[PDB]
Amino acid sequence: TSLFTTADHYHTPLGPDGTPHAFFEALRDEAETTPIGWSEAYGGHWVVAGYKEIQAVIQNTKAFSNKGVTFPRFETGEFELMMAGQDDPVHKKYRQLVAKPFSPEATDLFTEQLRQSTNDLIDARIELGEGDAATWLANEIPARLTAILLGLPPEDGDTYRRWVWAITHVENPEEGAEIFAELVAHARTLIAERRTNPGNDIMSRVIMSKIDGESLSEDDLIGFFTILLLGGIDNTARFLSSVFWRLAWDIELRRRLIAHPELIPNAVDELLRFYGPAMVGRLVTQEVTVGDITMKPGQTAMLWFPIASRDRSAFDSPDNIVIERTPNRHLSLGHGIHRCLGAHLIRVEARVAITEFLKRIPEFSLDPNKECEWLMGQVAGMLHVPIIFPKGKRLSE
Numbered sequence: 001t002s003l004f005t006t007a008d009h010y011h012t013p014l015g016p017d018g019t020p021h022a023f024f025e026a027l028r029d030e031a032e033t034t035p036i037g038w039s040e041a042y043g044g045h046w047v048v049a050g051y052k053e054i055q056a057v058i059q060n061t062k063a064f065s066n067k068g069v070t071f072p073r074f075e076t077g078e079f080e081l082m083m084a085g086q087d088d089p090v091h092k093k094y095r096q097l098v099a100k101p102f103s104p105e106a107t108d109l110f111t112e113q114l115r116q117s118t119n120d121l122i123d124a125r126i127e128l129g130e131g132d133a134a135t136w137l138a139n140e141i142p143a144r145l146t147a148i149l150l151g152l153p154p155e156d157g158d159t160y161r162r163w164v165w166a167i168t169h170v171e172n173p174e175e176g177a178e179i180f181a182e183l184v185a186h187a188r189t190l191i192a193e194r195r196t197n198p199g200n201d202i203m204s205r206v207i208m209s210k211i212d213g214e215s216l217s218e219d220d221l222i223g224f225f226t227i228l229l230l231g232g233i234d235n236t237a238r239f240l241s242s243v244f245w246r247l248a249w250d251i252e253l254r255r256r257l258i259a260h261p262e263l264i265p266n267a268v269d270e271l272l273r274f275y276g277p278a279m280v281g282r283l284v285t286q287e288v289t290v291g292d293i294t295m296k297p298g299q300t301a302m303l304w305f306p307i308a309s310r311d312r313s314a315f316d317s318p319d320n321i322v323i324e325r326t327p328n329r330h331l332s333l334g335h336g337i338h339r340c341l342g343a344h345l346i347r348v349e350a351r352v353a354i355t356e357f358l359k360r361i362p363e364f365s366l367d368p369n370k371e372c373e374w375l376m377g378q379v380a381g382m383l384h385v386p387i388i389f390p391k392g393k394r395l396s397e
């Protein structure tokens with residue numbers, strides 16, 4: 001028997017702690033013998049679990065295409081995820097258009113805005129002594145930042161979350177497609193507005209950009225809008241939710257971050273290794289052998305980053321959160337030409353969120369009378385994290 005045979009990133013067995021990590025540890029153990037295995041899920045596909053094997057696949061862009069970046073494919077109608085859904089030479093030209101606004105200097109500009117937002121959000125429930133850290137904080141900090149990056153109203157987060165849920169999880173395909181079509185209608189209106197009144201934001205930037213002398217198509221612009229929306233509302237929210245959950249019960253980790261705030265950035269990196277929400281797919285375009293396995297054109301390989309990030313041949317003591325770990329070359333943000341555009345931004349966001357939360361609410365715990373819930377999928381992490389804490393004071397009003 002093999003754990004690969006029924007591996008399915010949308011249906012990972014959960015342990016008594018509520019996470020898939022016992023299952024990830026068991027699959028990591030099996031991957032020491034068999035680092036790539038066949039899953040019968042989704043009609044049959046390859047599951048790549050060893051660290052060196054994921055590296056080999058993800059570097060081999062001639063055989064492994066980002067046309068398969070989401071598997072099963074995210075619901076984005078006839079549109080594609082810009083950059084993430086493309087291969088070179090096209091990929092490189094599009095990524096060049098937005099490299100500057102995601103540079104460390106450009107994203108550092110938002111540090112105090114995130115700090116103020118985190119505190120304003122905390123203000124909303126600190127007097128109540130209870131709240132869902134996911135829906136109250138982890139969802140809202142990136143949703144508001146992302147609305148700002150895209151030049152959208154920050155108070156409409158539930159609308160944006162409804163779109164992202166349709167893209168990633170709504171099971172009825174007619175419903176899903178129709179809600180994504182609502183995103184498209186809103187993006188069209190935004191694009192038209194920015195054409196006449198261009199702002200400082202990233203949409204305005206790509207709308208005014210040119211490639212090889214020509215302006216981008218509306219379809220390309222909607223692809224930019226969609227992937228940047230997903231990065232915040234999905235990936236970042238699920239990561240931060242998992243982090244808040246971990247800090248709620250792991251009183252040892254928590255006291256060390258409070259005693260040593262200078263270790264928070266390295267701790268964020270180690271939490272990214274351990275709770276990194278993402279996996280990605282690759283479409284096989286040429287016959288290719290990786291280790292013992294020969295893959296054929298039209299097959300898909302799923303890169304199970306959480307398993308590789310636990311590989312004993314790549315990390316010492318991989319099942320422990322070692323906040324001083326370095327160089328920590330985990331695969332949670334990918335590797336090679338598609339490595340996460342938002343890497344610096346999410347590091348700033350996580351550092352500020354953790355720093356301010358632990359400053360305001362150093363004492364808290366999981367609510368014994370409400371359930372936590374892990375969301376499974378290509379982007380996986382806590383969805384509900386009910387916590388309790390002593391009632392406190394607002395900084396404002």
Ligand code: HEM
Binds near residue numbers: 235
């Ligand atoms: C914890 C949060 C995040 C995680 C774990 C994450 C993870 C990833 C991963 C694994 C990839 C590689 C894709 C591949 O190899 O096919 C990637 C690429 C990408 N990410 Fe992130 N992401 C996060 C947040 C964000 C945010 C906040 C943004 C932007 C607002 C963003 C924008 C992008 C883009 C545009 C790409 C494609 C880059 C390219 O294809 O060259 N991500 N991300």
Ligand SMILES: CC1(C)O[C@]2(C)CC[C@H]1CC2
Binds near residue numbers: 069084280
């Ligand atoms: C799932 C994952 C990793 O996140 C986004 C934002 C980037 C690459 C893919 C698809 C969308």
